[PDB]
Amino acid sequence: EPPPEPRITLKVGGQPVTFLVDTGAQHSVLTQNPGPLSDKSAWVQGATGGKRYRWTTDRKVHLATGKVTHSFLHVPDCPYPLLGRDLLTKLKAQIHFEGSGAQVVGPMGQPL
Amino acid sequence: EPPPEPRITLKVGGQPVTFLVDTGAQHSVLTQNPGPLSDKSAWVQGATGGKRYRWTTDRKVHLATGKVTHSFLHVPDCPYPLLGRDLLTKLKAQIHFEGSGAQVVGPMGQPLQ
Amino acid sequence: XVVX
Amino acid sequence: XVVX
């Protein structure tokens, strides 16, 4: 089962991750077998409560315009990886609600 | 507060509410002064856990696409009121990331704030 | 995030 | 949702 729309698949560390595109997320999230973790953590407040989660070490992320290096929160309590406002800014993404679903496009309307 | 961008202010039951636009939220959320509450509840899964919350009674919501009736989750644990995919579908909203910010646009290209 |  |  994929996450609901809007969603997007990006390569992270060389392999695709299908994210829920989440404008409510301050930073992007991985949820499962996230690879090497930093010793650093963040306090994460969700809709229902908060607690701390670990940062990943840096990952190569293949965006539209080329690779960036980015770190993710590892949140195993979250049901889906989340592509948050951090990476939406880097993508200069647009999110369009049309019909019953939603699509994510680039700064000039190309798909990603 | 106010919430970060993308954000929008809507009249909800006669009062302005400034929402974080949250494409990760299945349903929309009020956090404070929700008005009368229903005794119907839902289990809400968040990013960090889950809990049971009550629905409000029906509110008139003044969307740019026209006013409609909507019930909100009352989630006092949540940092900001959330405009979720339930209302974003009714608004046919576009959300554009530009600069360090984000702007909401209606289906006729009119900027919303 | 919020899922029912 | 997610807030630091």
Automatic annotation (TrEMBL), chain A:
<feature type="domain" description="Peptidase A2">
    <location>
        <begin position="17"/>
        <end position="87"/>
    </location>
</feature>
<protein>
    <recommendedName>
        <fullName>Gag-Pol polyprotein</fullName>
    </recommendedName>
</protein>
<comment type="subunit">
    <text>The reverse transcriptase is a monomer. Interacts (via RNase domains) with host release factor ETF1; this interaction is essential for translational readthrough of amber codon between viral gag and pol genes, as well as for viral replication.</text>
</comment>
<comment type="subunit">
    <text>Interacts (via PPXY motif) with host NEDD4. Interacts (via PSAP motif) with host TSG101. Interacts (via LYPX(n)L motif) with host PDCD6IP.</text>
</comment>
<comment type="function">
    <text>Forms the spherical core of the virion that encapsulates the genomic RNA-nucleocapsid complex.</text>
</comment>
<comment type="function">
    <text>Catalyzes viral DNA integration into the host chromosome, by performing a series of DNA cutting and joining reactions. This enzyme activity takes place after virion entry into a cell and reverse transcription of the RNA genome in dsDNA. The first step in the integration process is 3' processing. This step requires a complex comprising the viral genome, matrix protein and integrase. This complex is called the pre-integration complex (PIC). The integrase protein removes 2 nucleotides from each 3' end of the viral DNA, leaving recessed CA OH's at the 3' ends.</text>
</comment>
